[PDB]
Design a protein around this ligand. Structure first.
Ligand SMILES: C=CC(C)(C)OC[C@H]1O[C@H](O[C@@H]2C3=C([C@H](C)COC(C)=O)C[C@H](O)[C@]3(C)/C=C3/[C@@H](COC)CC[C@H]3[C@@H](C)[C@H]2O)[C@H](O)[C@@H](OC(C)=O)[C@@H]1O
Ligand SMILES: C=CC(C)(C)OC[C@H]1O[C@H](O[C@@H]2C3=C([C@H](C)COC(C)=O)C[C@H](O)[C@]3(C)/C=C3/[C@@H](COC)CC[C@H]3[C@@H](C)[C@H]2O)[C@H](O)[C@@H](OC(C)=O)[C@@H]1O
Lengths: 231, 231
């Protein structure tokens, strides 16, 4: 057994056990492990699922705490809001560390090793996703900065995805889902959001009509969002 | 607002956010906070729900990893088992710290402050529960020791519960559920387990027949177990 082999297995154990932080760590070793070559599809997916689950938990907590803050804030209960926001800060702190860790990994190892359209779009998308999560809770110039990095990353991913991957590709399809969610939720531009989602959903139907549980699911998400946003 | 007040609110926020470790911490402050008086019902319940969720996660991970170890162990795959058990140890380590933290809290503050049958049984039950979780993964003399502490604790809780709380009391009902699960799962004595569960379930039906979503649920659990164990 090899060290890389070990960590990947360990990662999959972590996943089964649902200790995502440890899954992240294992996949992070594997990543920093090799240099010239890039992560396999399985590995690349384990690394993102790991992070997705680590960030996801804080994101859900953030939302919960956030809506609670909103309600107490509107009831004038100023002592409750102070405790909620103090708690929120703690959560926004972990969100920041999490995004930082993966964003560093992306620029240092991940992106520089992308040897194909598949991985380049996968990694550039990730870059956009994590700056997007930062933008979700920031406000001042911090938000602008994160929103800008997000846009830059997604555009870069789209250029490649648009010319190198099939419209039915799940990575390209997910890039569209997230890119349009970005326009709707961070840039509050439902128009640019629906266009993008629509075009992507359409191009996929076309190709599917002329020429995976994977892509099918992502497309369902695009519909749920096209629907929802039309209201 | 008081420090105790703050931590309790914070704890409830932690619960909503599902960051149980932090919920435990907050309730632990509150606990070590007062001295003469004891935790309110709400507080006492928040403290146990906190721990329950913290220990529960490791317990579920442990089980997952454990069954995986079993399967690879039976396929002779000795390299996989070594990695699984190494991972398992890590989990058994957190289980131990978690049980230790709450068990110390029980002997130092919690139990010494129980001023009624309600709390004495609640805390003695907890004591039994956490030694039981230790017994779940131990084997040598470690298991014996934990199994013994469990039995001692549950018996002590039962004596009080049996004479001071109604058969329909959820704490007494839960003490029966756990005490009988202890006989079935740790002492591998389905007979002593079914008797206890049965008697408790019966005494509750009687009292309910002659003289809460709370007790109703616990009793359903007792049935599911009486049923299941009769197979
Ligand atoms: C078992 C765990 C691992 C190894 C992580 O695999 C999970 C999943 O990994 C793959 O799916 C990816 C994938 C996901 C799919 C949307 C899930 O599809 C279904 C129906 O299971 C979820 C993950 O987050 C993941 C890896 C991520 C992305 C995401 C990339 O951001 C940078 C946007 C697109 C999407 C792509 C990469 C999907 O291909 C597979 O195509 C999935 O479907 C199949 C064939 O069963 C499998 O369930
Ligand atoms: C909202 C969170 C808190 C404050 C923790 O309350 C959760 C719950 O807290 C109370 O329920 C307790 C209780 C639980 C009940 C079995 C849940 O009942 C239902 C239908 O919601 C779950 C918890 O683990 C807790 C606190 C624990 C125990 C356990 C004690 O071990 C030492 C064995 C018996 C049981 C007792 C103490 C139950 O009374 C209430 O009676 C519950 O039911 C009502 C009236 O809605 C409420 O949902």
């Amino acid at each position: 057994p090899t060290a890389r082999e070990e960590n990947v297995y360990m990662a999959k154990l972590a996943e089964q056990a649902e200790r995502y932080e440890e899954m992240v760590e294992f996949m992070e070793k594997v990543s920093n492990s090799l240099g010239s070559e890039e992560l396999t599809v399985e590995e690349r997916n384990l690394l993102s699922v790991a992070y997705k689950n680590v960030i996801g938990a804080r994101r859900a907590s953030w939302r919960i705490i956030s809506s609670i803050e909103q309600k107490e804030e509107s009831r004038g209960n100023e002592e409750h809001v102070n405790s909620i926001r103090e708690y929120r800060s703690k959560i926004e702190n972990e969100l920041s560390k999490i995004c930082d860790g993966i964003l560093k990994l992306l620029d240092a190892k991940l992106i520089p090793s992308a040897a194909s359209g598949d991985s380049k779009v996968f990694y550039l998308k990730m870059k956009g996703d994590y700056h997007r999560y930062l933008a979700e809770f920031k406000t001042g110039a911090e938000r602008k900065e994160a929103a800008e990095s997000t846009l830059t990353a997604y555009k870069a991913a789209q250029d490649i995805a648009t010319t190198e991957l099939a419209p039915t590709h799940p990575i390209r399809l997910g890039l569209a889902l997230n890119f349009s969610v970005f326009y709707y939720e961070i840039l509050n531009s439902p128009d640019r959001a629906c266009n993008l989602a629509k075009q992507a959903f359409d191009e996929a139907i076309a190709e599917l009509d002329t020429l995976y549980k994977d892509s099918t699911l992502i497309m369902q998400l695009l519909r749920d969002n096209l629907t929802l946003w039309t209201s």
